[PDB]
Amino acid sequence: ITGTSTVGVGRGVLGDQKNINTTYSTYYYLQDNTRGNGIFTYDAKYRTTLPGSLWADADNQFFASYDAPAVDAHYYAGVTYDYYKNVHNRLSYDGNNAAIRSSVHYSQGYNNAFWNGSQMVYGDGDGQTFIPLSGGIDVVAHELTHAVTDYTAGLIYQNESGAINEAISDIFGTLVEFYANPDWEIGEDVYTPGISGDSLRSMSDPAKYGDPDHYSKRYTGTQDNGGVHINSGIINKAAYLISQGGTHYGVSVVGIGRDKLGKIFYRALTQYLTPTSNFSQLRAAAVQSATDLYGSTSQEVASVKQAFDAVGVK
Ligand SMILES: [Ca+2]
Ligand SMILES: [Ca+2]
Ligand SMILES: [Ca+2]
Ligand SMILES: [Ca+2]
Ligand SMILES: [Zn+2]
């Protein structure tokens, strides 16, 4: 853990070569000392006990297939850190350079990734529905954004507040993807290696995969903790409209770009949203955020208003 900072090289899940910040002490550890209190990547070794062992490597080369998820987890955690630092002046997820820890090779054939309240966890996928989810920069940013949310708004993971929590992670997950071949889809890089052109969720058109793109169409049952991954499509659609514009259900929205989208939603996240905020309170938080930044008469406030009107959120 105490060692000499250095730079290693390896290949990611998608076979792309990347340099990665490591630490040398007998072994080369996946420990990035250049970012906050450090970014640490662990090997769970197909087990479920966490975090596992700090990834140790003999030669500082990571070209083994078994290394691939660790390379991308380590690397994309760094990119996501840079994003929040450089774009939003936030230092790590807690705002005080908290150590970012990630575990890969979690369980066997685990088709999911998550923030467990203290760290990143990535499954390898079963190789048909998913390949190792570390390969998706939007996936990585999505999960770390949960840390940001938990330390700020604190949106509980249930019903509409949970839907907002999920949406925030999709939105900033996408903005990081744009920050680093970007798009307004979620997990396309790691989802379904057999079929091309699909994804887990779409922000541009949520209904593509059965998720609501309007408040009238919202899920109200009990599964998915009240549809946190489902009803997020409603907010994801609004976020997309604010950035890219377009006409949705007859309501025209003027786009203001991704950078203003990020500034608005980040401010909403950190200044106005609470653990129990619903879509309507999010709407109000976004309108006030844009008002703070750009003025009550600005096109940015109008676009946010037209966006939530478009997805039926008053
Ligand atoms: Ca090696
Ligand atoms: Ca992409
Ligand atoms: Ca994407
Ligand atoms: Ca696919
Ligand atoms: Zn999530």
Side-chain angles (χ1 to χ4, degrees), residues 2-180 182-313:
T2 57
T4 305
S5 305
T6 194
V7 179
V9 61
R11 291 170 190 169
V13 175
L14 303 180
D16 58 324
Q17 181 171 313
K18 276 173 284 223
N19 292 339
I20 48 184
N21 290 111
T22 64
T23 301
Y24 175 65
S25 183
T26 310
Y27 289 90
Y28 297 88
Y29 294 85
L30 283 174
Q31 174 181 327
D32 190 347
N33 299 316
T34 71
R35 294 183 172 91
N37 292 336
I39 302 173
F40 308 79
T41 301
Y42 302 76
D43 192 354
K45 312 180 191 61
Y46 305 132
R47 309 286 304 196
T48 55
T49 60
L50 297 171
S53 316
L54 189 66
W55 194 285
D57 191 79
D59 57 18
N60 207 26
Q61 300 187 231
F62 302 79
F63 291 98
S65 61
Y66 188 86
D67 303 336
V71 171
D72 283 0
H74 195 74
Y75 183 87
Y76 288 150
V79 178
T80 306
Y81 174 94
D82 291 344
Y83 170 82
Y84 281 111
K85 184 183 178 290
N86 297 338
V87 181
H88 300 294
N89 245 83
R90 186 174 267 270
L91 305 160
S92 194
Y93 51 80
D94 70 331
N96 196 22
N97 276 324
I100 304 176
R101 299 177 198 287
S102 303
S103 292
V104 299
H105 297 303
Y106 175 82
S107 192
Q108 288 181 33
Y110 191 68
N111 293 323
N112 204 2
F114 60 88
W115 168 265
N116 72 343
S118 318
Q119 63 163 115
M120 234 60 54
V121 186
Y122 300 97
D124 295 324
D126 52 24
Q128 271 195 322
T129 310
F130 278 100
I131 61 181
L133 283 90
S134 292
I137 182 163
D138 56 349
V139 172
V140 171
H142 172 103
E143 301 303 342
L144 185 63
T145 295
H146 281 309
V148 174
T149 304
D150 294 354
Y151 272 92
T152 56
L155 295 156
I156 60 141
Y157 205 60
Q158 173 213 259
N159 298 331
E160 293 196 3
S161 54
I164 294 166
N165 194 312
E166 279 299 326
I168 293 286
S169 287
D170 281 349
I171 293 163
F172 284 109
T174 292
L175 292 185
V176 169
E177 183 175 306
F178 275 94
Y179 175 78
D183 53 68
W184 295 84
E185 309 292 304
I186 304 298
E188 70 288 340
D189 288 336
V190 294
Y191 185 72
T192 308
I195 311 175
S196 71
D198 64 338
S199 54
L200 188 49
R201 286 183 296 273
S202 178
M203 299 176 60
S204 58
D205 186 22
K208 187 97 66 48
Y209 307 115
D211 299 328
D213 57 8
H214 197 265
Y215 193 76
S216 67
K217 296 181 162 291
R218 68 193 177 285
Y219 175 73
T220 191
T222 63
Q223 85 187 65
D224 191 31
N225 296 101
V228 298
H229 295 96
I230 302 175
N231 291 331
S232 62
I234 300 166
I235 303 314
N236 281 346
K237 180 60 183 179
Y240 169 84
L241 287 168
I242 292 164
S243 183
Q244 303 305 103
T247 304
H248 192 50
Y249 288 103
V251 179
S252 293
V253 182
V254 186
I256 52 166
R258 65 176 88 89
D259 296 326
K260 285 174 178 175
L261 168 73
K263 284 183 75 174
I264 287 160
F265 267 73
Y266 178 84
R267 163 146 265 174
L269 178 66
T270 59
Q271 306 297 134
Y272 295 110
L273 288 177
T274 64
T276 52
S277 293
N278 56 28
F279 291 178
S280 198
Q281 289 171 289
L282 162 59
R283 143 111 166 160
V287 168
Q288 186 63 69
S289 298
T291 301
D292 299 339
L293 288 173
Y294 307 113
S296 71
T297 76
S298 61
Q299 177 62 240
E300 289 87 337
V301 165
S303 277
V304 168
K305 289 162 78 184
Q306 295 156 349
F308 283 92
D309 286 336
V311 301
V313 177

Short mmCIF file of all heavy atoms in Angstrom, two decimals, residues 161-222, unseen atoms left out:
data_model
loop_
_atom_site.label_atom_id
_atom_site.label_comp_id
_atom_site.label_asym_id
_atom_site.label_seq_id
_atom_site.Cartn_x
_atom_site.Cartn_y
_atom_site.Cartn_z
N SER A 161 -38.27 8.74 -5.64
CA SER A 161 -36.97 9.23 -5.20
C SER A 161 -35.88 8.29 -5.68
O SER A 161 -34.79 8.73 -6.06
CB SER A 161 -36.93 9.37 -3.68
OG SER A 161 -37.28 8.16 -3.06
N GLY A 162 -36.17 6.99 -5.67
CA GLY A 162 -35.25 5.99 -6.18
C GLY A 162 -35.11 6.09 -7.69
O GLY A 162 -34.03 5.86 -8.23
N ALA A 163 -36.20 6.43 -8.37
CA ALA A 163 -36.16 6.61 -9.81
C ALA A 163 -35.25 7.78 -10.17
O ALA A 163 -34.49 7.71 -11.13
CB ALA A 163 -37.55 6.84 -10.36
N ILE A 164 -35.33 8.84 -9.38
CA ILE A 164 -34.47 10.00 -9.57
C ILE A 164 -33.02 9.61 -9.32
O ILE A 164 -32.13 9.98 -10.08
CB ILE A 164 -34.88 11.16 -8.64
CG1 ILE A 164 -36.27 11.68 -9.03
CG2 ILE A 164 -33.87 12.29 -8.72
CD1 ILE A 164 -36.91 12.58 -7.99
N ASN A 165 -32.80 8.84 -8.26
CA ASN A 165 -31.47 8.34 -7.93
C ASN A 165 -30.87 7.60 -9.11
O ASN A 165 -29.72 7.84 -9.50
CB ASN A 165 -31.54 7.42 -6.70
CG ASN A 165 -30.17 7.13 -6.10
OD1 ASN A 165 -29.23 6.79 -6.80
ND2 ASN A 165 -30.07 7.27 -4.78
N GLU A 166 -31.66 6.71 -9.71
CA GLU A 166 -31.22 5.95 -10.87
C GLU A 166 -30.97 6.86 -12.06
O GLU A 166 -29.97 6.72 -12.77
CB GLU A 166 -32.25 4.89 -11.24
CG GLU A 166 -32.15 3.63 -10.40
CD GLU A 166 -30.81 2.95 -10.54
OE1 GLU A 166 -30.23 2.99 -11.64
OE2 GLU A 166 -30.33 2.38 -9.54
N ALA A 167 -31.88 7.81 -12.28
CA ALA A 167 -31.76 8.72 -13.41
C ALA A 167 -30.49 9.55 -13.30
O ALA A 167 -29.76 9.69 -14.28
CB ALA A 167 -32.99 9.61 -13.50
N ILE A 168 -30.23 10.10 -12.12
CA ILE A 168 -29.03 10.89 -11.89
C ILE A 168 -27.78 10.10 -12.31
O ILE A 168 -26.89 10.64 -12.96
CB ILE A 168 -28.89 11.31 -10.42
CG1 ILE A 168 -29.99 12.30 -10.02
CG2 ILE A 168 -27.53 11.94 -10.17
CD1 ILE A 168 -29.82 13.69 -10.57
N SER A 169 -27.75 8.82 -11.95
CA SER A 169 -26.63 7.96 -12.30
C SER A 169 -26.56 7.69 -13.80
O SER A 169 -25.47 7.58 -14.36
CB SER A 169 -26.73 6.63 -11.54
OG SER A 169 -26.41 6.81 -10.17
N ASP A 170 -27.71 7.59 -14.46
CA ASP A 170 -27.72 7.41 -15.91
C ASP A 170 -27.27 8.68 -16.61
O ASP A 170 -26.47 8.64 -17.54
CB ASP A 170 -29.10 7.00 -16.40
CG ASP A 170 -29.39 5.52 -16.18
OD1 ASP A 170 -28.45 4.77 -15.84
OD2 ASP A 170 -30.56 5.12 -16.35
N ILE A 171 -27.77 9.82 -16.14
CA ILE A 171 -27.46 11.10 -16.75
C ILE A 171 -25.97 11.41 -16.65
O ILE A 171 -25.32 11.67 -17.66
CB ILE A 171 -28.26 12.24 -16.10
CG1 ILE A 171 -29.75 12.08 -16.39
CG2 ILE A 171 -27.78 13.58 -16.62
CD1 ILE A 171 -30.65 12.90 -15.49
N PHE A 172 -25.42 11.37 -15.44
CA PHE A 172 -24.01 11.67 -15.26
C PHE A 172 -23.14 10.54 -15.78
O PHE A 172 -21.99 10.76 -16.16
CB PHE A 172 -23.71 11.94 -13.79
CG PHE A 172 -24.17 13.28 -13.32
CD1 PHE A 172 -25.24 13.40 -12.45
CD2 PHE A 172 -23.53 14.44 -13.75
CE1 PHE A 172 -25.66 14.63 -12.02
CE2 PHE A 172 -23.96 15.67 -13.32
CZ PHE A 172 -25.02 15.77 -12.45
N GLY A 173 -23.69 9.33 -15.80
CA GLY A 173 -23.02 8.22 -16.44
C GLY A 173 -22.80 8.53 -17.91
O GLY A 173 -21.75 8.23 -18.47
N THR A 174 -23.80 9.14 -18.53
CA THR A 174 -23.72 9.51 -19.93
C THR A 174 -22.81 10.71 -20.14
O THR A 174 -22.02 10.75 -21.08
CB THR A 174 -25.11 9.81 -20.50
OG1 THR A 174 -25.88 8.60 -20.53
CG2 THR A 174 -25.01 10.37 -21.90
N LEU A 175 -22.91 11.69 -19.25
CA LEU A 175 -22.08 12.89 -19.37
C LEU A 175 -20.60 12.54 -19.24
O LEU A 175 -19.76 13.16 -19.90
CB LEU A 175 -22.48 13.93 -18.33
CG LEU A 175 -23.87 14.55 -18.51
CD1 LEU A 175 -24.10 15.66 -17.50
CD2 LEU A 175 -24.06 15.07 -19.93
N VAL A 176 -20.28 11.55 -18.42
CA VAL A 176 -18.89 11.10 -18.30
C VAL A 176 -18.47 10.41 -19.59
O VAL A 176 -17.34 10.56 -20.05
CB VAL A 176 -18.69 10.16 -17.10
CG1 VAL A 176 -17.31 9.52 -17.16
CG2 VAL A 176 -18.86 10.91 -15.80
N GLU A 177 -19.39 9.66 -20.18
CA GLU A 177 -19.12 8.99 -21.45
C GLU A 177 -18.82 10.03 -22.53
O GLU A 177 -17.90 9.87 -23.33
CB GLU A 177 -20.29 8.11 -21.86
CG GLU A 177 -20.06 7.32 -23.14
CD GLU A 177 -21.20 6.37 -23.45
OE1 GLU A 177 -21.54 5.55 -22.57
OE2 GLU A 177 -21.75 6.43 -24.56
N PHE A 178 -19.59 11.12 -22.54
CA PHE A 178 -19.33 12.23 -23.44
C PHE A 178 -18.04 12.96 -23.07
O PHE A 178 -17.35 13.49 -23.93
CB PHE A 178 -20.50 13.22 -23.44
CG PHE A 178 -21.60 12.85 -24.39
CD1 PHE A 178 -22.69 12.11 -23.96
CD2 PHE A 178 -21.55 13.25 -25.71
CE1 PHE A 178 -23.70 11.77 -24.83
CE2 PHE A 178 -22.56 12.92 -26.59
CZ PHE A 178 -23.63 12.18 -26.15
N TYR A 179 -17.72 12.97 -21.78
CA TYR A 179 -16.52 13.63 -21.28
C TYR A 179 -15.26 12.90 -21.74
O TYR A 179 -14.26 13.53 -22.09
CB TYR A 179 -16.56 13.71 -19.75
CG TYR A 179 -15.31 14.26 -19.11
CD1 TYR A 179 -15.05 15.62 -19.09
CD2 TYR A 179 -14.39 13.41 -18.50
CE1 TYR A 179 -13.92 16.13 -18.50
CE2 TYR A 179 -13.25 13.91 -17.91
CZ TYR A 179 -13.02 15.27 -17.91
OH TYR A 179 -11.88 15.76 -17.31
N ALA A 180 -15.32 11.57 -21.74
CA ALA A 180 -14.19 10.76 -22.17
C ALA A 180 -14.17 10.64 -23.69
O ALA A 180 -13.13 10.83 -24.32
CB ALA A 180 -14.26 9.38 -21.54
N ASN A 181 -16.68 6.95 -27.97
CA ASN A 181 -17.81 7.03 -28.87
C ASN A 181 -19.11 7.16 -28.08
O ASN A 181 -19.78 6.16 -27.81
CB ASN A 181 -17.87 5.79 -29.77
N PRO A 182 -19.48 8.40 -27.72
CA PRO A 182 -20.57 8.58 -26.76
C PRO A 182 -21.97 8.49 -27.37
O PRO A 182 -22.13 8.51 -28.59
CB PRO A 182 -20.31 9.98 -26.21
CG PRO A 182 -19.72 10.71 -27.35
CD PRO A 182 -18.92 9.69 -28.14
N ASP A 183 -22.96 8.40 -26.49
CA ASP A 183 -24.36 8.29 -26.89
C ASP A 183 -25.24 8.49 -25.67
O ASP A 183 -24.73 8.68 -24.57
CB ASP A 183 -24.64 6.94 -27.55
CG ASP A 183 -24.19 5.76 -26.70
OD1 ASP A 183 -24.79 5.53 -25.63
OD2 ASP A 183 -23.25 5.06 -27.12
N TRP A 184 -26.55 8.44 -25.88
CA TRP A 184 -27.51 8.57 -24.79
C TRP A 184 -28.16 7.21 -24.49
O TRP A 184 -29.34 7.13 -24.15
CB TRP A 184 -28.57 9.62 -25.14
CG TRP A 184 -27.97 10.98 -25.25
CD1 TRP A 184 -27.35 11.52 -26.34
CD2 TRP A 184 -27.91 11.98 -24.23
NE1 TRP A 184 -26.92 12.79 -26.07
CE2 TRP A 184 -27.26 13.10 -24.77
CE3 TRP A 184 -28.36 12.04 -22.90
CZ2 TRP A 184 -27.03 14.27 -24.04
CZ3 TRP A 184 -28.14 13.20 -22.18
CH2 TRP A 184 -27.48 14.30 -22.75
N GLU A 185 -27.35 6.16 -24.61
CA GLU A 185 -27.76 4.81 -24.25
C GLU A 185 -26.97 4.39 -23.02
O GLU A 185 -25.94 4.99 -22.70
CB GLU A 185 -27.52 3.83 -25.40
CG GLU A 185 -28.11 4.29 -26.73
CD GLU A 185 -29.62 4.29 -26.73
OE1 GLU A 185 -30.21 3.24 -26.44
OE2 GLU A 185 -30.21 5.35 -27.01
N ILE A 186 -27.45 3.35 -22.33
CA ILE A 186 -26.80 2.87 -21.11
C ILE A 186 -26.32 1.43 -21.24
O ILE A 186 -27.10 0.52 -21.50
CB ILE A 186 -27.75 2.97 -19.89
CG1 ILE A 186 -28.26 4.41 -19.72
CG2 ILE A 186 -27.04 2.52 -18.63
CD1 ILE A 186 -27.18 5.44 -19.45
N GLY A 187 -25.01 1.24 -21.07
CA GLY A 187 -24.43 -0.08 -20.97
C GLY A 187 -24.29 -0.82 -22.29
O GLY A 187 -24.12 -2.04 -22.30
N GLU A 188 -24.35 -0.09 -23.40
CA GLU A 188 -24.29 -0.69 -24.72
C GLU A 188 -22.97 -1.41 -24.98
O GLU A 188 -22.91 -2.37 -25.75
CB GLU A 188 -24.54 0.37 -25.81
CG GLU A 188 -23.42 1.40 -26.00
CD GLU A 188 -23.31 2.41 -24.87
OE1 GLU A 188 -24.29 2.58 -24.11
OE2 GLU A 188 -22.24 3.03 -24.74
N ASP A 189 -21.90 -0.94 -24.35
CA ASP A 189 -20.58 -1.51 -24.56
C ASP A 189 -20.42 -2.90 -23.94
O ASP A 189 -19.64 -3.71 -24.43
CB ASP A 189 -19.50 -0.58 -24.00
CG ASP A 189 -19.33 0.68 -24.83
OD1 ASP A 189 -19.66 0.66 -26.03
OD2 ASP A 189 -18.85 1.70 -24.28
N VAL A 190 -21.18 -3.17 -22.88
CA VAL A 190 -21.01 -4.41 -22.12
C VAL A 190 -22.24 -5.32 -22.20
O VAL A 190 -22.20 -6.46 -21.75
CB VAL A 190 -20.71 -4.11 -20.63
CG1 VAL A 190 -19.35 -3.44 -20.50
CG2 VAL A 190 -21.81 -3.25 -20.02
N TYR A 191 -23.32 -4.81 -22.78
CA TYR A 191 -24.59 -5.52 -22.81
C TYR A 191 -24.74 -6.32 -24.10
O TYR A 191 -24.54 -5.79 -25.18
CB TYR A 191 -25.74 -4.53 -22.65
CG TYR A 191 -27.12 -5.13 -22.53
CD1 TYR A 191 -27.51 -5.81 -21.38
CD2 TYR A 191 -28.04 -5.00 -23.56
CE1 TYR A 191 -28.77 -6.35 -21.26
CE2 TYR A 191 -29.31 -5.54 -23.45
CZ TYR A 191 -29.67 -6.22 -22.30
OH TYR A 191 -30.92 -6.76 -22.18
N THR A 192 -25.08 -7.60 -23.95
CA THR A 192 -25.42 -8.48 -25.08
C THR A 192 -24.38 -8.46 -26.20
O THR A 192 -24.61 -7.88 -27.26
CB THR A 192 -26.80 -8.10 -25.65
OG1 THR A 192 -27.77 -8.06 -24.59
CG2 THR A 192 -27.26 -9.13 -26.67
N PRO A 193 -23.22 -9.09 -25.96
CA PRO A 193 -22.15 -9.12 -26.97
C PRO A 193 -22.55 -9.80 -28.28
O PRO A 193 -21.86 -9.62 -29.28
CB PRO A 193 -21.03 -9.90 -26.27
CG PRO A 193 -21.71 -10.69 -25.21
CD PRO A 193 -22.84 -9.82 -24.74
N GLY A 194 -23.63 -10.57 -28.27
CA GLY A 194 -24.08 -11.27 -29.46
C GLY A 194 -24.87 -10.39 -30.40
O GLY A 194 -24.80 -10.55 -31.62
N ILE A 195 -25.61 -9.44 -29.84
CA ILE A 195 -26.47 -8.56 -30.62
C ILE A 195 -25.92 -7.14 -30.61
O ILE A 195 -25.63 -6.58 -29.55
CB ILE A 195 -27.92 -8.55 -30.07
CG1 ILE A 195 -28.42 -9.98 -29.86
CG2 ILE A 195 -28.84 -7.78 -31.02
CD1 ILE A 195 -29.79 -10.05 -29.22
N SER A 196 -25.77 -6.56 -31.80
CA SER A 196 -25.22 -5.21 -31.93
C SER A 196 -26.33 -4.17 -32.01
O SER A 196 -27.40 -4.43 -32.56
CB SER A 196 -24.33 -5.12 -33.17
OG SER A 196 -25.10 -5.17 -34.35
N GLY A 197 -26.06 -2.99 -31.46
CA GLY A 197 -26.95 -1.85 -31.61
C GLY A 197 -28.01 -1.70 -30.54
O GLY A 197 -28.85 -0.82 -30.63
N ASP A 198 -27.96 -2.56 -29.52
CA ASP A 198 -28.92 -2.49 -28.42
C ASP A 198 -28.24 -2.02 -27.14
O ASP A 198 -27.04 -1.75 -27.13
CB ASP A 198 -29.59 -3.84 -28.20
CG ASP A 198 -28.62 -4.91 -27.75
OD1 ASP A 198 -27.41 -4.74 -28.01
OD2 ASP A 198 -29.06 -5.91 -27.15
N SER A 199 -29.02 -1.95 -26.07
CA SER A 199 -28.51 -1.50 -24.78
C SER A 199 -29.48 -1.81 -23.65
O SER A 199 -30.58 -2.33 -23.89
CB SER A 199 -28.23 0.01 -24.81
OG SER A 199 -29.37 0.73 -25.23
N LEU A 200 -29.07 -1.49 -22.43
CA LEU A 200 -29.86 -1.78 -21.24
C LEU A 200 -30.99 -0.76 -21.10
O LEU A 200 -32.15 -1.13 -20.87
CB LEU A 200 -28.96 -1.77 -20.01
CG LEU A 200 -29.53 -2.24 -18.66
CD1 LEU A 200 -30.25 -3.58 -18.77
CD2 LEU A 200 -28.39 -2.33 -17.65
N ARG A 201 -30.65 0.51 -21.26
CA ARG A 201 -31.63 1.59 -21.20
C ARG A 201 -31.30 2.64 -22.24
O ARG A 201 -30.15 2.80 -22.64
CB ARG A 201 -31.66 2.24 -19.82
CG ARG A 201 -32.32 1.39 -18.76
CD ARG A 201 -32.37 2.13 -17.45
NE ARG A 201 -31.04 2.39 -16.91
CZ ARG A 201 -30.35 1.55 -16.15
NH1 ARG A 201 -30.85 0.37 -15.81
NH2 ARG A 201 -29.15 1.89 -15.72
N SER A 202 -32.33 3.37 -22.67
CA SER A 202 -32.15 4.47 -23.60
C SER A 202 -32.69 5.75 -22.98
O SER A 202 -33.82 5.79 -22.50
CB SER A 202 -32.86 4.18 -24.92
OG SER A 202 -32.73 5.27 -25.82
N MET A 203 -31.86 6.79 -22.97
CA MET A 203 -32.30 8.09 -22.51
C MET A 203 -33.01 8.84 -23.63
O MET A 203 -33.94 9.61 -23.39
CB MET A 203 -31.11 8.90 -21.99
CG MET A 203 -30.39 8.24 -20.82
SD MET A 203 -28.92 9.14 -20.28
CE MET A 203 -29.62 10.73 -19.83
N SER A 204 -32.58 8.59 -24.86
CA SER A 204 -33.17 9.23 -26.03
C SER A 204 -34.58 8.72 -26.28
O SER A 204 -35.49 9.50 -26.58
CB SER A 204 -32.30 8.99 -27.27
OG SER A 204 -32.14 7.60 -27.53
N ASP A 205 -34.77 7.41 -26.13
CA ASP A 205 -36.08 6.79 -26.33
C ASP A 205 -36.26 5.61 -25.37
O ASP A 205 -36.04 4.46 -25.76
CB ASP A 205 -36.24 6.33 -27.78
CG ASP A 205 -37.63 5.80 -28.08
OD1 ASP A 205 -38.58 6.15 -27.34
OD2 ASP A 205 -37.78 5.05 -29.06
N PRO A 206 -36.67 5.89 -24.12
CA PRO A 206 -36.79 4.86 -23.09
C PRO A 206 -37.76 3.74 -23.47
O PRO A 206 -37.54 2.59 -23.09
CB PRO A 206 -37.31 5.62 -21.87
CG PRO A 206 -37.04 7.06 -22.15
CD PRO A 206 -37.10 7.21 -23.63
N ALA A 207 -38.80 4.09 -24.21
CA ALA A 207 -39.85 3.15 -24.58
C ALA A 207 -39.32 2.02 -25.46
O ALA A 207 -39.96 0.98 -25.61
CB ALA A 207 -40.98 3.87 -25.28
N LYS A 208 -38.15 2.24 -26.05
CA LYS A 208 -37.49 1.24 -26.87
C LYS A 208 -37.38 -0.09 -26.14
O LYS A 208 -37.56 -1.15 -26.74
CB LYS A 208 -36.09 1.73 -27.28
CG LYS A 208 -35.39 0.83 -28.29
CD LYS A 208 -35.55 1.32 -29.72
CE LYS A 208 -34.85 2.65 -29.96
NZ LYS A 208 -33.46 2.65 -29.42
N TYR A 209 -37.10 -0.02 -24.84
CA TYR A 209 -36.91 -1.21 -24.02
C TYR A 209 -38.00 -1.34 -22.95
O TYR A 209 -37.81 -2.03 -21.95
CB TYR A 209 -35.52 -1.18 -23.38
CG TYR A 209 -34.41 -0.98 -24.38
CD1 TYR A 209 -33.63 0.17 -24.36
CD2 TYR A 209 -34.14 -1.94 -25.35
CE1 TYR A 209 -32.61 0.36 -25.28
CE2 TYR A 209 -33.13 -1.76 -26.27
CZ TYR A 209 -32.37 -0.61 -26.24
OH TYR A 209 -31.36 -0.44 -27.16
N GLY A 210 -39.13 -0.68 -23.18
CA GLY A 210 -40.30 -0.85 -22.33
C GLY A 210 -40.39 0.08 -21.14
O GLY A 210 -41.29 -0.05 -20.32
N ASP A 211 -39.45 1.02 -21.03
CA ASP A 211 -39.47 1.98 -19.93
C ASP A 211 -40.31 3.21 -20.30
O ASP A 211 -40.27 3.66 -21.44
CB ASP A 211 -38.06 2.40 -19.55
CG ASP A 211 -37.21 1.23 -19.09
OD1 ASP A 211 -37.77 0.29 -18.49
OD2 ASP A 211 -35.99 1.25 -19.34
N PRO A 212 -41.05 3.76 -19.32
CA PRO A 212 -41.93 4.90 -19.60
C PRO A 212 -41.15 6.14 -20.03
O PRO A 212 -40.09 6.42 -19.48
CB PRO A 212 -42.63 5.12 -18.26
CG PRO A 212 -41.71 4.57 -17.24
CD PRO A 212 -41.05 3.39 -17.89
N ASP A 213 -41.69 6.85 -21.02
CA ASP A 213 -41.13 8.12 -21.46
C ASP A 213 -42.09 9.26 -21.14
O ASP A 213 -41.98 10.36 -21.68
CB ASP A 213 -40.83 8.08 -22.97
CG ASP A 213 -42.06 7.74 -23.80
OD1 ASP A 213 -43.18 7.69 -23.25
OD2 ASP A 213 -41.89 7.54 -25.03
N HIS A 214 -43.06 8.98 -20.27
CA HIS A 214 -44.03 9.98 -19.87
C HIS A 214 -44.61 9.59 -18.51
O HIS A 214 -44.69 8.41 -18.18
CB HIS A 214 -45.14 10.11 -20.91
CG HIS A 214 -45.95 11.36 -20.78
ND1 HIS A 214 -47.14 11.41 -20.08
CD2 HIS A 214 -45.74 12.61 -21.25
CE1 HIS A 214 -47.63 12.64 -20.13
NE2 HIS A 214 -46.80 13.39 -20.84
N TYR A 215 -45.00 10.59 -17.74
CA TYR A 215 -45.44 10.37 -16.37
C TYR A 215 -46.73 9.57 -16.32
O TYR A 215 -46.97 8.81 -15.39
CB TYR A 215 -45.62 11.70 -15.64
CG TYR A 215 -45.77 11.56 -14.15
CD1 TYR A 215 -44.67 11.28 -13.34
CD2 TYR A 215 -47.01 11.69 -13.54
CE1 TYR A 215 -44.81 11.15 -11.97
CE2 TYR A 215 -47.16 11.56 -12.17
CZ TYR A 215 -46.05 11.29 -11.39
OH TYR A 215 -46.21 11.16 -10.03
N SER A 216 -47.57 9.74 -17.34
CA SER A 216 -48.82 9.00 -17.43
C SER A 216 -48.58 7.50 -17.56
O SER A 216 -49.46 6.69 -17.25
CB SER A 216 -49.65 9.48 -18.63
OG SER A 216 -49.00 9.14 -19.84
N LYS A 217 -47.39 7.13 -18.02
CA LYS A 217 -47.06 5.74 -18.30
C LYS A 217 -46.21 5.11 -17.20
O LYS A 217 -45.68 4.00 -17.37
CB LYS A 217 -46.32 5.64 -19.64
CG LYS A 217 -47.17 6.06 -20.83
CD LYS A 217 -46.40 5.92 -22.14
CE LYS A 217 -47.33 5.90 -23.34
NZ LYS A 217 -48.14 4.65 -23.41
N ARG A 218 -46.09 5.79 -16.07
CA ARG A 218 -45.19 5.37 -15.00
C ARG A 218 -45.62 4.05 -14.36
O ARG A 218 -46.81 3.79 -14.20
CB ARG A 218 -45.10 6.45 -13.92
CG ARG A 218 -46.39 6.65 -13.15
CD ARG A 218 -46.37 7.92 -12.33
NE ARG A 218 -47.63 8.16 -11.64
CZ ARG A 218 -48.74 8.59 -12.22
NH1 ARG A 218 -48.76 8.83 -13.53
NH2 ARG A 218 -49.84 8.78 -11.50
N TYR A 219 -44.64 3.24 -13.99
CA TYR A 219 -44.90 1.99 -13.28
C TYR A 219 -45.22 2.27 -11.81
O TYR A 219 -44.56 3.09 -11.18
CB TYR A 219 -43.69 1.06 -13.38
CG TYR A 219 -43.82 -0.20 -12.57
CD1 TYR A 219 -44.68 -1.22 -12.96
CD2 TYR A 219 -43.09 -0.37 -11.40
CE1 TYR A 219 -44.81 -2.37 -12.22
CE2 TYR A 219 -43.21 -1.52 -10.65
CZ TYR A 219 -44.07 -2.52 -11.07
OH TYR A 219 -44.19 -3.67 -10.32
N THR A 220 -46.23 1.58 -11.28
CA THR A 220 -46.69 1.85 -9.92
C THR A 220 -46.84 0.58 -9.08
O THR A 220 -47.45 0.60 -8.01
CB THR A 220 -48.03 2.61 -9.93
OG1 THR A 220 -48.33 3.09 -8.61
CG2 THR A 220 -49.17 1.72 -10.42
N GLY A 221 -46.27 -0.53 -9.56
CA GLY A 221 -46.27 -1.76 -8.80
C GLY A 221 -45.15 -1.79 -7.77
O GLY A 221 -44.57 -0.75 -7.47
N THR A 222 -44.85 -2.97 -7.25
CA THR A 222 -43.94 -3.11 -6.12
C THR A 222 -42.54 -3.57 -6.50
O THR A 222 -41.59 -3.36 -5.74
CB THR A 222 -44.49 -4.11 -5.08
OG1 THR A 222 -44.59 -5.41 -5.68
CG2 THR A 222 -45.87 -3.68 -4.59
#
